[PDB]
Design a protein around this ligand. Structure first.
Ligand SMILES: [Mg+2]
Ligand SMILES: [Mg+2]
Ligand SMILES: [Mg+2]
Ligand SMILES: [Mg+2]
Ligand SMILES: [Mg+2]
Ligand SMILES: [Mg+2]
Ligand SMILES: [Mg+2]
Ligand SMILES: [Mg+2]
Ligand SMILES: [Mg+2]
Ligand SMILES: [Mg+2]
Ligand SMILES: [Mg+2]
Ligand SMILES: [Mg+2]
Ligand SMILES: [Mg+2]
Ligand SMILES: [Mg+2]
Ligand SMILES: [Mg+2]
Ligand SMILES: [Mg+2]
Ligand SMILES: [Mg+2]
Ligand SMILES: [Mg+2]
Ligand SMILES: [Mg+2]
Ligand SMILES: [Mg+2]
Ligand SMILES: [Mg+2]
Ligand SMILES: [Mg+2]
Ligand SMILES: [Mg+2]
Ligand SMILES: [Mg+2]
Ligand SMILES: [Mg+2]
Ligand SMILES: [Mg+2]
Ligand SMILES: [Mg+2]
Ligand SMILES: [Mg+2]
Ligand SMILES: [Mg+2]
Ligand SMILES: [Mg+2]
Ligand SMILES: [Mg+2]
Ligand SMILES: [Mg+2]
Ligand SMILES: [Mg+2]
Ligand SMILES: [Mg+2]
Ligand SMILES: [Mg+2]
Ligand SMILES: [Mg+2]
Ligand SMILES: [Mg+2]
Ligand SMILES: [Mg+2]
Ligand SMILES: [Mg+2]
Ligand SMILES: [Mg+2]
Ligand SMILES: [Mg+2]
Ligand SMILES: [Mg+2]
Ligand SMILES: [Mg+2]
Ligand SMILES: [Mg+2]
Ligand SMILES: [Mg+2]
Ligand SMILES: [Mg+2]
Ligand SMILES: [Mg+2]
Ligand SMILES: [Mg+2]
Ligand SMILES: [Mg+2]
Ligand SMILES: [Mg+2]
Ligand SMILES: [Mg+2]
Ligand SMILES: [Mg+2]
Ligand SMILES: [Mg+2]
Ligand SMILES: [Mg+2]
Ligand SMILES: [Mg+2]
Ligand SMILES: [Mg+2]
Ligand SMILES: [Mg+2]
Ligand SMILES: [Mg+2]
Ligand SMILES: [Mg+2]
Ligand SMILES: [Mg+2]
Ligand SMILES: [Mg+2]
Ligand SMILES: [Mg+2]
Ligand SMILES: [Mg+2]
Ligand SMILES: [Mg+2]
Ligand SMILES: [Mg+2]
Ligand SMILES: [Mg+2]
Ligand SMILES: [Mg+2]
Ligand SMILES: [Mg+2]
Ligand SMILES: [Mg+2]
Ligand SMILES: [Mg+2]
Ligand SMILES: [Mg+2]
Ligand SMILES: [Mg+2]
Ligand SMILES: [Mg+2]
Ligand SMILES: [Mg+2]
Ligand SMILES: [Mg+2]
Ligand SMILES: [Mg+2]
Ligand SMILES: [Mg+2]
Ligand SMILES: [Mg+2]
Ligand SMILES: [Mg+2]
Ligand SMILES: [Mg+2]
Ligand SMILES: [Mg+2]
Ligand SMILES: [Mg+2]
Ligand SMILES: [Mg+2]
Ligand SMILES: [Mg+2]
Ligand SMILES: [Mg+2]
Ligand SMILES: [Mg+2]
Ligand SMILES: [Mg+2]
Ligand SMILES: [Mg+2]
Ligand SMILES: [Mg+2]
Ligand SMILES: [Mg+2]
Ligand SMILES: [Mg+2]
Ligand SMILES: [Mg+2]
Ligand SMILES: [Mg+2]
Ligand SMILES: [Mg+2]
Ligand SMILES: [Zn+2]
Lengths: 240, 46, 147, 110
RNA sequence: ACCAAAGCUAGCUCAACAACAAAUACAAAAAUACACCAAAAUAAAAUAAAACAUUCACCUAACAUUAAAGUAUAGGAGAUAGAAAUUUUUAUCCUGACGCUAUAGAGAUAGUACCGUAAGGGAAAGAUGAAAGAAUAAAAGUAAAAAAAAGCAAAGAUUACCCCUUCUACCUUUUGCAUAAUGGUUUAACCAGAAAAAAUCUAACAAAGAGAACUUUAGCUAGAUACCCCGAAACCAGACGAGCUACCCAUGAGCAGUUUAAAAGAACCAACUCAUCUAUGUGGCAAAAUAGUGAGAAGACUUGUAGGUAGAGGUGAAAA
RNA sequence: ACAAACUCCUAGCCCAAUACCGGACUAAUCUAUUGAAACAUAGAAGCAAUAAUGUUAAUAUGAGUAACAAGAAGCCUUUCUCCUCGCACACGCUUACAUCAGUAACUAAUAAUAUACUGAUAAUUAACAACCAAUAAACCAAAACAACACUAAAACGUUUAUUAAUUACAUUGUUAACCCAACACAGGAGUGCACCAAGGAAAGAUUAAAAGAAGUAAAAGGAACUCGGCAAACACAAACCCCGCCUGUUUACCAAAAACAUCACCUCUAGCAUUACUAGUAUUAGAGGCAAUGCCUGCCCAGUGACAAGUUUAACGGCCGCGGUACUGACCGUGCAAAGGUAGCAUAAUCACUUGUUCUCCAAAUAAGGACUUGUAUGAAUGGCCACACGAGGGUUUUACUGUCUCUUACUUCCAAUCAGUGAAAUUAACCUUCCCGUGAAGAGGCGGGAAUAAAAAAAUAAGACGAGAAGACCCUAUGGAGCUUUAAUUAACUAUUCCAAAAGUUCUUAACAUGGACUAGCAAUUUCGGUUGGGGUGACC
C-alpha cells in the first residue's frame, strides 16, 4: 500500500542517528534488488563531503581543523574521522595514515606556485602539483565529493588544460573537471579491506547479504572475457 | 504438520483488514458495502 | 429447487385472423341455423308496455321461447327506456346493439330475437360480400360507392 | 468386507428370534417368610437386607459420634443398646451405644 | 397397532394503470483540536467457422409499430453480418388471469440459522374447532405371526402350502450379455422434443386471392401437422485473501547446567526447535497423530505482537 | 411309436420383430357450452417414470454389530490406594462462572449428579492495567555482574530555554472449568515463577479362548534370519570405501539426499544524488558461473551467440581418419578439420558386451577393497585429480551383544468373549444364496448331466462372490485442455536502442520532457502440432 522513507532529517548532528533498513524493497514494498536484508542493526553517521565549507557565513577565509578521533563505520567500507574547529564538529572520510590529535587544512585558494600537501589536506584541483594522489573528488564545483570514496582507493591528477584539470578514476577512466573543484590529497583509510577473508557463510548474514538463488542458468552470449578499448574521457565542462 | 487450525484469532487484525473503515477507504471496498446492502445483509462489515 | 426444464414461457398471445369471407359466411350460417330450427323470432317496435322484468319472463313463457334469450337492436342510443331497464335487470335474457352480433353469443342463447330495422341492416351488410372486389387498401379510406 | 446384499426380513426374523436369543424363564423364584416379597432361592431377601442395612447405617452414625476423630477407634468390644435396656455383666467393660428405637423384633437380645 | 397420512391458507408469479432523541467513517454506532483534499486510460474471452489465426449477431444507445427486406450492400466473398430513401399507426377510458398452491410459486416465515478470515455462499419449515375463557387407519419400515430337504422364486396346476414339471433378473451397451460388462436398497414427490421455407391434410374465395405494402400460367389466404435432459478440464473480466505458509520491515523475548583461555556457524546434554528409523493407527485420538528412537541445542537459532508484497502476479539457500 | 409357431379340426375380434416412419384409441388436469356423484363434445397444455454413481424427504440392511466410560470402602465427604503440564499474566473467547431449584426427555458419546443440560435470581468495586505535551539547543564514545575490551559496531534520555487549560471525584478492562482444530478432540498454543504446599485418576461388572497390540524373562547356539544386523540387545566399540568439503536449507501431508546454499576462485555490466540500490561511489554495487583448502585448468574464433570486419571459450559448444611397415607400431603415405582429447583418473553412482581379468577377503562372494585397463559413449570452473575434519547420506568387513533365527515358550496389561447402558460406517436388482465335471461373451450358487441335502444361532479362518472403496493416474482415441522450450507460424503493448519527421533555434545544432512513422533486440502475446495402420511409436504409403 504505502511506506514512508527513513531519511528525514533536516539538521546536521554528529551524534549517530537511528536508521531503518529496507531489504531490497521499493516504496511499494516489492523486491527490486535481490539478496539484501537481515543485517546486524546499524546506526547511521552523517558525513560532510563538502570539505571547504565556511562555518560563519560572514568570514570567507580558509579553515584549520583538528582530528579528535578515528572510528569504524558500519555504513561505508572506509574509516571515518571526527574533525572539529570553531564551534563545529563533522564526520569526514579519513585519509590513510590520519591519527588522533592531528591537524587538517582546508582552502579554496589557488596560488600559481601550488602547494605540497599532507594527507589531511584539501585543496582546489588546480592548486595541486601534477603528480599528486587524490580521493573524494568533486564533480561540479560546490557540489560536494562523489567519486573515489571507497576503502583504500585513490585517484591521480594527470594534466591541466585551459584552467581545467584531468584526473584518473580508479577504473582508469579519465575525468575532465574545472580547476575550482576541491579534492583531498591521499589514500582513503584501511587499505587492507580488500584482503579480509570472510570465514563462514555467517559473516555474510552479518553484513546483510542473502544467499543467491538455486535456479540454474546457462551462461548467455553475454558471458566470456570481452576485451574493450577503454571508454573515452568524461567531460564535466560545458561549452559557452 | 497437522492443518485446519489456520485461523489464529486476533481482534486488531480482524478490524484492520475487514473493518468498516478499511472498506470505506477504497472505491472497491465501497462497492463491497454497496453490494452487501443491495443483498440486505444483517452485517455489512467486520 | 431447480429451474423448470421447459414449462410455460413469457406472456403468450394466440392471435390469428380468419379471412373475412369465412367470418361472414360463418355469421350467415348461424342466422340460417337459428331460422331453420324455429328458434329465431323477428320482432318489430320493441317498445315494452312496462319496465317490470316479470313481464319479460312471462312473455318468454307464454310464447314458449325456451330458456335463454338474446335481443338485438339497431343502435345503442336508440334503445327504448323500458326495454333497457327490464333487460338490464336479468341474467338469462340479454340485450345487445346490432353492431355486436356474433356467432359465439348466438350459440350461447337458445333463442335469438331481431328488430326489423336490424334485419334490414344485417341483410345488407352481409349480402354485400358476395359482390365485392378484393380490398385495395383498408376499407375505411375513400372508395367510389363504399363510404 | 462389505455385505453383498440387503438381508430379507425373513432371514432376520430367523436369526434374532432364535430360542437362544430369547430370555430364559427363571424357575428359582420364591417368597420370603417375613415380608412376603419375592427373592431368588440362593440370594438374600432384598427387602429384609434393606432394613438390616438402614439400621446398620444409623448405628454406625451414632458410633461415629461416640468417636472423636478419623483415626480414633475403640479397643473394647462394642455392644448396642435400645430404650429400656441395662448392660449385663458379660457385656460390661465394653463400649456402649444407646439408641431411641425400641429393640426391633428381628434383632435379638442374646 | 405403531411410524405415518390427509386438508387451504400464508404468500407469490406475470401484466395493465400510474416513532423520535442521542450515536455514528477512532478499531462505524466513542460529544470535543491544525487541515489537506481528491483522481482518471476501447470491454474481453468462452463460443461459431465441425481446426484455427481476418471475421462471430445479442451484450450501449435508444426507439418504437406495418412495410421497403433478409433486398442494396459487407464478408479467410466462407461462417455469417445487414441498412436507408420512401411509406403505415385514433383518443382516452375498461382490468385482469385456459398463472402457482407449502419439494410448487419469490431464495424468503430470511438474506435470517448455519458455512466462509474475507469477497461470497445460503437453508429448513405452517395445518382440529363457532369457541381449547370448551378436550383416513390406505407408501416403504416394522409389529400381530421365527424357520423345516430344491435352487431368478414364479408358472402349469392340484383335494392339498410345499413336494412334481417347465422356464438363463431388468435396463443400457454391443457382432454377441445369465454374464464374473454399466446402473439401481426400498417408498413418495419432483425430473427430459420446443420452430412452419418447401410440403401433405381440411376449408374460404377464385383468374385471381389476402382487413395496405405481397404473391399469382389454379392460384392465393387460414387452420392443423416439427426438431430433448444432466455432465468436463478450460478460457476472459472484476473483486476478495500474507490471522496458514514464502520472504522481508519494525518492536519485544528466551537459551540451564557440564567442558574448554573461548558464545569458537567447537564438544556433551536439558528446556526449546526440527522429523531420521521402526511399529501401531488407516471412517484414526489426529483430513498426517501416538510410543519408542533420533538430529540441532549462542546461532545462516528458535519464538511473541504488529505492518508490507496479490494471481498475466507475489515470494523462492529451485523442491516448477 | 414319440415328438414343433408347421398343417388340419371347432370358433374368432384373423398372422414376429431392434433404428427410423405411418395409423387408431385413451389416464390426469384446466377452459367453452352441456352435466349434476362419478359427465361429453370441442379447445388447450408445466399432458402420464421400473432405470440419469438423478435431486430432496423418509425409511430399512450392515447391526443391536464397531466403538465409547466411573480407583476402593464407608458414617456421605472420611479415610485409603496410586499417577504427576501446577498457579498467574498476555492474546483470544463471551456468561459457559456464582446461589437456589428441576431433571420424564433433551447436553455428557453411557449412568450416578451437574463446571458444561432447563428456570429463576444475583455478579467482577482501583492504588494494578488502558487513555494519557510540543518546539529549540547541547551531548563521537555499546549491551555482555562491566574494570575494560571484541567485531558483526549495537534497543532504550537527561538537562538548560520558551509556552503548556489548573480546579475532590473522568471514562474504560476486572467472573470462568475458557482459546484455534465440525466434538466436553491422546493434537496447536507466547511469558513469569514452581516441582510440590499445588493438580489429578490408568479398571462399568465379570470371565480368563484364539487371533492382534505393548512389555518382561529364557536352556544350548550367537546373524545360521533377511533385500539389508530392520527391530531387539547384560552390547554401545573399531576399520575400509563412493559422494558431498564443513554448521546450514528444501518437496506443510509418500523423497532429507550425493540436490540447493556456502567460505573461496573467476566472467561479465555499470563514472553517478533525493523513496529501492544508497543518504552508497569501482578495495564499491548489481546480473551470474563453479564450490573451501592443496596440485592443476591443455588445444580450439570455423558455426550460433554476444560485444563494440576484428575480438572473445573461467560464452553456447567442439576436441579424427584410412591403410603400410621393427605380435605390435617409435616411424611412413595420403585425406579431411576451427582444433584433432592433454594432465590426470579409470569396468566407475559412467550405453552395451558384463558375472571383464586377476589378487586379497570367506568353508564357499554376481558383494567389498587393490590392481591391470582404448572409457572407442572418461576428462579438467557444465571443473579433473589426491587429503584432513565432518554426515540420522549410500555401501563392505571385524569385535561384542542378543528370541532376528535353528525353534519356539511362560506370564502380565490393552483389546478379547459373557452381563448392563448408549449406538455409527462403506455397502446392498431381487435372492428360497451347495459341490463336481461339461457348456457358455472363451474362469457358473443360478445353464446341461450327475451328486449331496431337517431347521435355525454363537464362535473362528480368509479360498471364492472376477469382494468393498475411487466413471484406470498405464495404454490409445477426441480436428478436448493446459504447463514448459525453441530455428513452429503469425506478431502488439512495454522496456531499451538507432533513424526520419515534428518542435525550438541557427545559418548545421538538441537540455530535459514529448508525439507520428520506421528499424534492432530483449522480455513477451495468439494458435496448432495431418491420416492410414492386425494397439500406438519407428519404418513405409497417401
Ligand atoms: Mg551497506
Ligand atoms: Mg554468487
Ligand atoms: Mg547455482
Ligand atoms: Mg476451516
Ligand atoms: Mg422455483
Ligand atoms: Mg471453433
Ligand atoms: Mg460442434
Ligand atoms: Mg481445438
Ligand atoms: Mg464478442
Ligand atoms: Mg419454498
Ligand atoms: Mg463467522
Ligand atoms: Mg404398510
Ligand atoms: Mg421346487
Ligand atoms: Mg445367452
Ligand atoms: Mg444402465
Ligand atoms: Mg465388446
Ligand atoms: Mg464373462
Ligand atoms: Mg468392470
Ligand atoms: Mg463400460
Ligand atoms: Mg452397484
Ligand atoms: Mg408454409
Ligand atoms: Mg391446389
Ligand atoms: Mg482462444
Ligand atoms: Mg479452444
Ligand atoms: Mg499483513
Ligand atoms: Mg504475517
Ligand atoms: Mg549454554
Ligand atoms: Mg555448537
Ligand atoms: Mg520398544
Ligand atoms: Mg546431540
Ligand atoms: Mg555434532
Ligand atoms: Mg528458506
Ligand atoms: Mg531441479
Ligand atoms: Mg522436475
Ligand atoms: Mg404332436
Ligand atoms: Mg409386423
Ligand atoms: Mg412432465
Ligand atoms: Mg415414482
Ligand atoms: Mg457406488
Ligand atoms: Mg432412481
Ligand atoms: Mg438397524
Ligand atoms: Mg458381524
Ligand atoms: Mg467390542
Ligand atoms: Mg476410569
Ligand atoms: Mg484477557
Ligand atoms: Mg443423557
Ligand atoms: Mg479491552
Ligand atoms: Mg484483555
Ligand atoms: Mg481471571
Ligand atoms: Mg478435525
Ligand atoms: Mg472396560
Ligand atoms: Mg493372546
Ligand atoms: Mg511378544
Ligand atoms: Mg528382553
Ligand atoms: Mg536364548
Ligand atoms: Mg545370510
Ligand atoms: Mg537364507
Ligand atoms: Mg550379506
Ligand atoms: Mg538398529
Ligand atoms: Mg562401488
Ligand atoms: Mg552435506
Ligand atoms: Mg550447528
Ligand atoms: Mg520444512
Ligand atoms: Mg515430504
Ligand atoms: Mg520424510
Ligand atoms: Mg552442489
Ligand atoms: Mg572488473
Ligand atoms: Mg576444487
Ligand atoms: Mg578448459
Ligand atoms: Mg590418455
Ligand atoms: Mg558400464
Ligand atoms: Mg567424452
Ligand atoms: Mg563450458
Ligand atoms: Mg561431462
Ligand atoms: Mg574443516
Ligand atoms: Mg548436516
Ligand atoms: Mg557415515
Ligand atoms: Mg452389549
Ligand atoms: Mg439354502
Ligand atoms: Mg468352450
Ligand atoms: Mg466351469
Ligand atoms: Mg464378534
Ligand atoms: Mg474370503
Ligand atoms: Mg453372481
Ligand atoms: Mg480377485
Ligand atoms: Mg474410463
Ligand atoms: Mg491427445
Ligand atoms: Mg485441439
Ligand atoms: Mg483472438
Ligand atoms: Mg500424428
Ligand atoms: Mg492415428
Ligand atoms: Mg503397428
Ligand atoms: Mg493386434
Ligand atoms: Mg514416420
Ligand atoms: Zn424378606
Amino acid at each position: 500500500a504505502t511506506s514512508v522513507s527513513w531519511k528525514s532529517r533536516t539538521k546536521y548532528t554528529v551524534m549517530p542517528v537511528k536508521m531503518r533498513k529496507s531489504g531490497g524493497r521499493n516504496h511499494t514494498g516489492q523486491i527490486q534488488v535481490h539478496g539484501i536484508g537481515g543485517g546486524h542493526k546499524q546506526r547511521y553517521r552523517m558525513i560532510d563531503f563538502l570539505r571547504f565549507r565556511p562555518e560563519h557565513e560572514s568570514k570567507p577565509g580558509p579553515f584549520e581543523e583538528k582530528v579528535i578521533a578515528v572510528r569504524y563505520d558500519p555504513c561505508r567500507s572506509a574509516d571515518i574521522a571526527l574533525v572539529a574547529g570553531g564551534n563545529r564538529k563533522r564526520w569526514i572520510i579519513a585519509t590513510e595514515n590520519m591519527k588522533a590529535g592531528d591537524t587538517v587544512l582546508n582552502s579554496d585558494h589557488i596560488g600559481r606556485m601550488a602547494v605540497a600537501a599532507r594527507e589531511g589536506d584539501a585543496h582546489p584541483l588546480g592548486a595541486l602539483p601534477v603528480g599528486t594522489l587524490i580521493n573524494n573528488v568533486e564533480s561540479e564545483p560546490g557540489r560536494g565529493a562523489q567519486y573515489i570514496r571507497a576503502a583504500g582507493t585513490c585517484g591521480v591528477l594527470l594534466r591541466k588544460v585551459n584552467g581545467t584539470a584531468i584526473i584518473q578514476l580508479p577504473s582508469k577512466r579519465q575525468m575532465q573537471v574545472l580547476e575550482t573543484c576541491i579534492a583531498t590529497v591521499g589514500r582513503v583509510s584501511n587499505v587492507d579491506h580488500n584482503k579480509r577473508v570472510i570465514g563462514k557463510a555467517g559473516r555474510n548474514r552479518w553484513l546483510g547479504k542473502r544467499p543467491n538463488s538455486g535456479l540454474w542458468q546457462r551462461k548467455g552470449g553475454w558471458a566470456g572475457r570481452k576485451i574493450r578499448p577503454l571508454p573515452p574521457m568524461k567531460s564535466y565542462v560545458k561549452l559557452p | 504438520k497437522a492443518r485446519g487450525n489456520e485461523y489464529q484469532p486476533s481482534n486488531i487484525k480482524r478490524k484492520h483488514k475487514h473493518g468498516w473503515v478499511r472498506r470505506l477507504r477504497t472505491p472497491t471496498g465501497v462497492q463491497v458495502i454497496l453490494r452487501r446492502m443491495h443483498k440486505g445483509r444483517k452485517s455489512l462489515s467486520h | 429447487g431447480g429451474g423448470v426444464a421447459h414449462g410455460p414461457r413469457g406472456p403468450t398471445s394466440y392471435y390469428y385472423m380468419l379471412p373475412m369471407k369465412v367470418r361472414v359466411q360463418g355469421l350467415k350460417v348461424a342466422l340460417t341455423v337459428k331460422l331453420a330450427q324455429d328458434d329465431l323470432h323477428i320482432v318489430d317496435s320493441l317498445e315494452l308496455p312496462t319496465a317490470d322484468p316479470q313481464y319479460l319472463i312471462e312473455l318468454a313463457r307464454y310464447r314458449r321461447w325456451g330458456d335463454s334469450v338474446l335481443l338485438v337492436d339497431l343502435e345503442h342510443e336508440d334503445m327504448p327506456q323500458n326495454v333497457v331497464a327490464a333487460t338490464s335487470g336479468l341474467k338469462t335474457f340479454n340485450l345487445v346493439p346490432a353492431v355486436g352480433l356474433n356467432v359465439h353469443s348466438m350459440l350461447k342463447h337458445q333463442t335469438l330475437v331481431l328488430t326489423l330495422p336490424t334485419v334490414a341492416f344485417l341483410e345488407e351488410k352481409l349480402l354485400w360480400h358476395n359482390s365485392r372486389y378484393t380490398p385495395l387498401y383498408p376499407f375505411r379510406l375513400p372508395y367510389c360507392d363504399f363510404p | 468386507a462389505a455385505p453383498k446384499n440387503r438381508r430379507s426380513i425373513e432371514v432376520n426374523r430367523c436369526r434374532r428370534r432364535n430360542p437362544q436369543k430369547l430370555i430364559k424363564v427363571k424357575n428359582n423364584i420364591d417368597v420370603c417368610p417375613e415380608c412376603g416379597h419375592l427373592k431368588q432361592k440362593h440370594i438374600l431377601c432384598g427387602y429384609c437386607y434393606e432394613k438390616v442395612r438402614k439400621e446398620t447405617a444409623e448405628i454406625r452414625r451414632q458410633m461415629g459420634k461416640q468417636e472423636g476423630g478419623p483415626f480414633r477407634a475403640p479397643t473394647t468390644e462394642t455392644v448396642v443398646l435400645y430404650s429400656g435396656e441395662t448392660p449385663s455383666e458379660q457385656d460390661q467393660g465394653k463400649r456402649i451405644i444407646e439408641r431411641e428405637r425400641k429393640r426391633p423384633s428381628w434383632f435379638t437380645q442374646n
